[PDB]
Amino acid sequence: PAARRRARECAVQALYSWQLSQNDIADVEYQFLAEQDVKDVDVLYFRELLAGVATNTAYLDGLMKPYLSRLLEELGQVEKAVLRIALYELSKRSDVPYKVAINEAIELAKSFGAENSHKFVNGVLDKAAPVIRPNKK
Amino acid sequence: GPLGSMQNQRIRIRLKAFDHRLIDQATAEIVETAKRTGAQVRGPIPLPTRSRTHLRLVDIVEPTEKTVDALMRLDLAAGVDVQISLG
Numbered sequence: 001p002a003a004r005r006r007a008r009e010c011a012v013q014a015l016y017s018w019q020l021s022q023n024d025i026a027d028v029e030y031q032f033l034a035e036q037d038v039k040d041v042d043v044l045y046f047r048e049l050l051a052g053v054a055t056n057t058a059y060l061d062g063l064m065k066p067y068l069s070r071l072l073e074e075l076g077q078v079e080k081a082v083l084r085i086a087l088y089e090l091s092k093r094s095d096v097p098y099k100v101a102i103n104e105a106i107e108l109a110k111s112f113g114a115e116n117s118h119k120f121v122n123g124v125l126d127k128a129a130p131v132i133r134p135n136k137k
Numbered sequence: 138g139p140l141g142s143m144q145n146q147r148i149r150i151r152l153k154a155f156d157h158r159l160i161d162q163a164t165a166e167i168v169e170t171a172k173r174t175g176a177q178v179r180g181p182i183p184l185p186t187r188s189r190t191h192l193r194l195v196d197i198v199e200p201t202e203k204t205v206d207a208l209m210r211l212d213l214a215a216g217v218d219v220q221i222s223l224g
């Protein structure tokens with residue numbers, strides 16, 4: 001429950017490291033899990049988000065691009081990670097409900113991003129999410 | 138140089154900024170700087186805050202003399218604050 005939310009927060013951070021350092025995702029994953037205090041984290045789900053975003057980056061971004069008013073590379077780094085996480089869940093995780101994916105993204109954009117970030121993130125997901133999940137569930 | 142008198146071969150860098158674009162570019166430049174000189178990078182990570190401040194942490198490990206030199210000549214954009222510890 002909460003452990004899965006903590007996994008998302010950690011995935012935002014670890015995905016950020018991967019975007020900025022351009023280290024191997026596997027070294028990013030290992031170092032994060034080794035160094036950080038992940039005592040309350042659903043670690044398996046953390047690993048699946050990392051793997052899930054890292055191996056499908058271009059596909060996830062593709063679900064997103066039509067809905068940005070700008071190029072992908074003009075997006076804030078944290079914004080990109082949160083959205084990738086959400087879109088991965090929407091497209092690849094049936095054990096995550098529609099509302100949960102969107103709301104968890106909103107909360108991540110609040111903790112890790114700007115004042116207005118969550119509004120941008122929600123705006124993109126409002127367009128993108130129904131296309132990935134037409135019944136919205 | 139101080140590196141020879143340093144028990145922990147690590148350069149820890151903390152950034153604060155109001156603009157996330159500037160903090161992300163600053164972070165990118167720090168990483169590029171470290172790697173060009175043959176050092177390694179742990180992180181960087183963004184830290185959560187409930188305010189309008191953006192926070193980043195980055196560790197530079199296995200630094201060389203040129204790493205320190207290159208970091209000491211690096212100009213960050215105005216609006217980005219920095220803390221450097223050769224702990």
Ligand SMILES: [K+]
Pocket residue numbers: 033034035036037038
């Ligand atoms: K640990």
